[PDB]
From Swiss-Prot:
GO terms for molecular function: aspartic-type endopeptidase activity. The keyword Manganese does not apply. It catalyses: Hydrolysis of proteins with specificity similar to that of pepsin A, prefers hydrophobic residues at P1 and P1', but does not cleave 14-Ala-|-Leu-15 in the B chain of insulin or Z-Glu-Tyr. Clots milk. This is Endothiapepsin. The gene is EAPA.
Length: 330
């Protein structure tokens, strides 16, 4: 089997992407944030504290003839941005772009933190990291991809995120019309539960490529590109007026600037992030100070190849017995 679904930016900055997902019988369609940095499929629901729902579409398990309470199971998750959610668990039928999994754990939120409530466009998350990170207790549950894998034509999914435009998540096949050149594959460590790999270096604008190993994660659920302080300093030093602002919480730059591109290495290959992809707009409405899309990871503990980086590429998440990642230009 295969599946193919369009993913759409939630706003004009590409802060996140939503993909429609059918849950239950008859189908309830919710728009979920596909997140290769986590491993829980959780949804706003009829059980979510009412004051914490503000415009999201909810899953109501009592209206699904295929929903079954997973007795005793609870979940609770906290994300790198400080947001969180928790609740109980049903199993139900879940379909993405024509690909159907029966018995998928659907984690029903009883509580969500303010940032989830405040984002009316995201109805939940669909985790695509390794199932060892799933938070369901006392019996850990498998991701949608793990459950689908055996049925797929090939044990892969691909992320093709658009810049200010829709893109595609495919399951079970590699669309050879969706990229240019060849796909370069690189080794993955699953030891932390992430799609963790090692970039071979970077360049800033038209500058020379610096060969240096940068370990990080391919994370569709993170907006920006988080890299070591040395790398980020070298980038912003090429932008007149850019500075790190403790009050704002990262590098800012004059909105009148034209940003240089940023290149990262995948083996001997190179992915170029155009400068415009690194502009995240005014720090506050009407400000002439703009927020940078490349930021230091020094306070995170891990480097993160988020949407800024991934949307410059066609990305293969290869879930073969030894997982790997593939990157192509597009």
């Amino acid at each position: 089997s295969t599946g193919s679904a369009t993913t759409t930016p939630i706003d004009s900055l590409d802060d996140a992407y939503i993909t429609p997902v059918q849950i239950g019988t008859p189908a309830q369609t919710l728009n979920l944030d596909f997140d290769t940095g986590s491993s829980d499929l959780w949804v706003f629901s009829s059980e979510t504290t009412a004051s914490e729902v503000d415009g999201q579409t909810i899953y109501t398990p009592s209206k699904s003839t295929t929903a079954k309470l997973l007795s005793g199971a609870t979940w609770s998750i906290s994300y790198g941005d400080g947001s969180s959610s928790s609740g109980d668990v049903y199993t139900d039928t879940v379909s993405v772009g024509g690909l159907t999994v029966t018995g998928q754990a659907v984690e029903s939120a009883k509580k969500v933190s303010s940032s989830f409530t405040e984002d009316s466009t995201i109805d939940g998350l669909l985790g695509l990291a390794f199932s060892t990170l799933n938070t369901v207790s006392p019996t850990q549950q498998k991701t949608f991809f793990d459950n689908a894998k055996a049925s797929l034509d090939s044990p892969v999914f691909t992320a093709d995120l658009g810049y200010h435009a829709p893109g595609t998540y495919n399951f079970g096949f590699i669309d050879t019309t969706a990229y240019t050149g060849s796909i370069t594959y690189t080794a993955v460590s699953t030891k932390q539960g992430f799609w963790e790999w090692t970039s071979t270096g970077y360049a800033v604008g038209s500058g020379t490529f610096k060969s240096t190993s940068i370990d990080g994660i391919a994370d569709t659920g993170t907006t920006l590109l988080y890299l070591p302080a040395t790398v980020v300093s070298a980038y912003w030093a090429q932008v007149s007026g850019a500075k790190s602002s403790s009050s704002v919480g990262g590098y800012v730059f004059p909105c009148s600037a034209t940003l240089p591109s940023f290149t990262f290495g995948v083996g001997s290959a190179r992915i170029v992030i155009p400068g415009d992809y690194i502009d995240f707009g005014p720090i506050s409405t009407g400000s002439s100070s703009c927020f940078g899309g490349i930021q230091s990871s020094a306070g995170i503990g891990i480097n993160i190849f988020g949407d800024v980086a991934l949307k410059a590429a066609f990305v293969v998440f290869n879930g073969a017995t030894t997982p790997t990642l593939g990157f192509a230009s597009k």
